[PDB]
């Protein structure tokens, strides 16, 4: 499975929502974007 940069970028704006199984613990709150979805 190979994907060019332009092919990967075609999906970028279509997936703004954090996965529901992504756990945001207190010690990694500083990693999260200022705005999350």
């Amino acid at each position: 499975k190979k994907y060019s940069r332009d092919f990967l970028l075609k999906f970028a704006e279509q997936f703004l929502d954090l996965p529901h199984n992504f756990e945001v613990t207190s010690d990694i709150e500083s990693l999260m974007s200022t705005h999350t979805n």
Partner: protein
């Protein structure tokens, strides 16, 4: 129908205020879902390290094949590494390196005077594979100057 990546990849984070796994993603859609919700390097705290390594490769002493291997490093002005980091990630997960089987993962180190991005590789003594990775990375980035290689 999601687009599976050839490998699963794990983000790891070393918070300055040690190295913790964040999330393992296995598709293009999962990559963007996470990438669009974590800070780009321009907004990470000083002394933070953000890692993206192939699943089950720890960026630690636990995996000497990678920990004692090669490292390709590029320096950016502080806050000017965002595109270099993204393009490095897309090249890795997209399996665009001819010698990508030697690539373990990449890390961005946010520091006071500069942002550093490194690719950790296996088989540092394979001169041809390391040269191929360094040359291709400079093409993926189109960087004018210093791409440095280190071997322990």
């Amino acid at each position: 129908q999601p687009h599976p990546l050839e490998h699963s990849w794990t983000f790891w984070f070393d918070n300055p205020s040690s190295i913790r796994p964040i999330y393992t993603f296995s598709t293009v859609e999962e990559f963007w879902s996470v990438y669009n919700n974590i800070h780009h390097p321009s907004k990470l705290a000083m002394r933070a390290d953000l890692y993206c390594f192939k699943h089950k490769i720890e960026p630690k002493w636990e995996d000497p094949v990678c920990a004692n291997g090669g490292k390709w490093t590029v320096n950016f002005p502080r806050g000017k590494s965002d595109n270099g980091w993204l393009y490095t990630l897309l090249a890795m997960i997209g399996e665009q390196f001819d010698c990508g089987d030697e690539i373990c993962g990449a890390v961005v180190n946010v520091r006071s005077g500069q942002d550093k991005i490194s690719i950790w590789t296996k088989n540092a003594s394979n001169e041809a594979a390391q040269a191929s990775i360094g040359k291709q990375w400079k093409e993926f980035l189109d960087y004018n100057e210093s791409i440095g290689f280190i071997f322990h």
